[PDB]
Design a protein around this ligand. Sequence first.
Ligand SMILES: *C(=O)[C@H](N)CC(C)C
Ligand SMILES: [Y+3]
Ligand SMILES: [Y+3]
Length: 427
Amino acid sequence: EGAERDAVGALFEELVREHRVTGAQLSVYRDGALSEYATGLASVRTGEPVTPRTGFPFGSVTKFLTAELVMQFVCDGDLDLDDPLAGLLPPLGTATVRQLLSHTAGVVDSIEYDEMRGPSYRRFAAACARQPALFPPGLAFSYSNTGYCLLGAVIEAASGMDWWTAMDSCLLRPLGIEPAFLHDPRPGQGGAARPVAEGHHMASLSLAAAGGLVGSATDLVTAARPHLADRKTFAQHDLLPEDAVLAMRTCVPDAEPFGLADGWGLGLMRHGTGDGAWYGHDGAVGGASCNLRIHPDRSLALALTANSTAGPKLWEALVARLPEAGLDVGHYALPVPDSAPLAPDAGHLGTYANGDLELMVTHDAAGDLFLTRESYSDYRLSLHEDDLFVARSGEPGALPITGRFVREHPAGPVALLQYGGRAMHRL
Ligand SMILES: *C(=O)[C@H](N)CC(C)C
Ligand SMILES: [Y+3]
Ligand SMILES: [Y+3]
């Protein structure tokens, strides 16, 4: 196996050059032992090198950790997975903790809340109540940062600790992870600050439970250790029982995360089907990207952190090449529509919204359909079979969109527009 681990480092280092990555970490747990590759600089500004201790923004990969912390309370009886929120916090009250974890509660992606100034998530839960639901809870998938900030408020209500203090004391420190955040509102105590990589977002106090953690590839792989077939070899596996781990990778049915993944569990997404299924999470904060992938049956976990804007393309080039060391990480691909533009059903015209994001489906006088947005270019919209759509903006700077429409009933009209993992309610 010593030559496989060599291969990965050769490939890793060569891909960080070819995508001109300032600094990166890659950690791999495989065949019962850990490989840690760290390269480049934590800051060009200062010349300090990346080491495996350097903190990188996790961004939305925080969700996998917030999910694990929430599962801990489900296992300690302190919180129920499948019964209404309205019992735990002052429409939304019919959503369950299980739905928020799988992005099926119908919460919008982003509700602005600049007003949060401290560690409590109480006042944030109030402004969420004031907000329209994308759909009835359970109807479909729609990725939501705000849903995971709601879990920060559930955790705080479930235990008695703010989300930060529960993250640190129930999950992070028992795993030997040095706690580190984009923003910590607590006075805290002293001690050297953990070295962190800069990445010139979810830099905003209310987004913490959804995107605020900071850490290394090795921390993420360590948080993956309870999820593995060989979990009993991990001395802290007790922190996440075999049944919470199983629930975390059990995908919600009848809710395809269209555009992001084949399926979603509780804080883990799925790419692939059977023996080729991988689980994990992606994130990005400015110049920093983060990916975590887990093959539980093979007891495999890898995580990449990178503080350059090629971070997404480094990750994709790493997935395309990692097979050259036997790591066939699952892939997600949008479906290419098989057909030709279908008769522009006008039962599709209207305004689709997710919070403050807004599209309009219009026609022009020739009858073709368009997808417009505030300070975007217009797209030509083509309807296809299975309610698929492609939207093309002839301009090369603006990528095409593959989406789909969603009806609440097989006889009803189009209710949801869905792409990139987000749904947008027809107004
Ligand atoms: C977090 O950094 C972002 N919003 C998540 C991806 C999966 C869109
Ligand atoms: Y109950
Ligand atoms: Y405001």
